[PDB]
Design an enzyme around this catalytic site. Structure first.
Site, PDB file in Angstrom:
ATOM      1  NE  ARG A  98      46.878  71.212  72.899  1.00 39.49           N
ATOM      2  CZ  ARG A  98      47.574  71.595  73.959  1.00 39.49           C
ATOM      3  NH1 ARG A  98      48.443  72.587  73.894  1.00 39.49           N
ATOM      4  NH2 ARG A  98      47.395  70.959  75.101  1.00 39.49           N
ATOM      5  CB  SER A 123      47.603  65.902  70.084  1.00 44.04           C
ATOM      6  OG  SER A 123      46.814  65.429  69.023  1.00 44.04           O
ATOM      7  CD  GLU A 169      46.893  62.629  67.132  1.00 44.44           C
ATOM      8  OE1 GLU A 169      46.385  61.557  66.788  1.00 44.44           O
ATOM      9  OE2 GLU A 169      47.086  62.925  68.339  1.00 44.44           O
TER      10      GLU A 169
END
Length: 217
Positions: A98, A123, A169
Site C-alpha cells: 500500500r 486497501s 485487491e
C-alpha cells in the site's frame, strides 16, 4: 529489505496476467460462508473499489459529519454492508502493498514495534506496481506529508475482493492495526514494513492514528 518495492515495475502484460491469476484464485477459494452473501453485499463490494471507498473512507476519517444528512445514513449502511460482505469472502495471507501520504511529524516518531491504526478501510494489492500508482501526487496540506510505501505481512484481517471486482485487491475493515517491523528512511524514500495485529493483543507499545498522527489510547 523491501526488495519487491525497489525493483523495476513488471510489464503491463505481466501485471495483468498476475491480476487475472489472483482473481481466479479468489473465486476458487470461496468457502461455505460465500453462500450467505447477499445481492446488496455483492453490489456494495463491486462498487467499493471504483467509487464507494472515497465517501466511506471520508466518513470514517471525519471529525464531524453534521453536514452529511441522508448521505451519512447511507454511508453508515454502506460501511456495514461492506464489512458484512468481507467476512464472507476468502482470507488472503501473505505479503501485500500500500502507498499513502503520512505526516512528517508522525513519521519522525515511528519505531519498530509501534502500532499504526488505520481509521478508514485499508486497501492493499499483492502487486507492488499497483501500490506505487496510488501515491504519486502530493495532496494540499498545511503540514508536510511524505510518501510512504508499506510492505504488509498479512496473517489476519485481510480478505480478497478480487473475485467480485484495482488489481489483486485485499481489503481490511476499518480500524485495522499494523505493527511496524522495519523502517527504511533515506533522503529519497520511506519504506515501512508492518505486520497485521489484533487490537486486543496490542500491549505496552505506542499506537498512532495513521491519518491524523494522533496517539491512540
Amino acid at each position: 529489505p523491501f526488495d519487491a518495492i525497489k525493483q523495476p515495475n513488471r510489464s503491463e502484460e505481466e501485471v495483468t496476467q498476475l491480476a487475472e491469476d489472483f482473481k481466479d484464485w479468489s473465486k476458487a477459494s470461496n468457502g461455505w460462508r460465500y453462500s450467505f452473501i447477499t445481492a446488496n453485499e455483492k453490489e456494495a463490494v463491486e462498487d467499493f473499489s471504483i467509487s464507494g471507498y472515497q465517501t466511506a473512507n471520508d466518513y470514517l476519517r471525519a471529525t464531524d459529519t453534521s453536514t452529511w444528512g441522508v448521505a451519512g445514513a447511507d454511508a453508515r449502511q454502506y460501511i456495514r454492508t461492506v464489512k458484512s460482505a468481507l467476512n464472507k469472502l476468502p482470507k488472503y495471507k501473505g505479503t501485500a502493498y500500500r502507498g499513502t501520504w503520512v505526516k512528517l511529524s508522525l513519521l519522525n516518531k515511528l519505531e519498530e514495534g509501534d502500532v499504526l491504526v488505520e481509521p478508514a478501510f485499508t486497501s492493499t494489492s499483492t502487486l507492488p506496481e499497483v501500490a506505487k500508482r496510488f501515491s504519486v501526487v502530493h495532496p494540499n496540506s498545511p503540514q508536510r506529508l511524505k510518501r510512504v510505501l508499506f510492505e504488509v505481512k498479512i496473517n489476519q484481517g485481510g480478505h480478497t475482493i478480487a473475485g467480485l471486482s484495482k488489481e489483486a485487491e485485499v481489503l481490511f475493515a476499518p480500524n485495522a492495526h499494523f505493527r511496524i517491523t522495519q523502517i527504511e528512511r533515506t533522503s529519497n524514500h520511506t519504506y515501512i514494513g508492518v505486520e497485521t495485529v489484533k487490537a486486543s493483543a496490542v500491549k505496552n507499545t505506542q499506537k498512532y492514528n495513521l491519518y491524523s498522527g494522533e496517539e491512540v489510547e
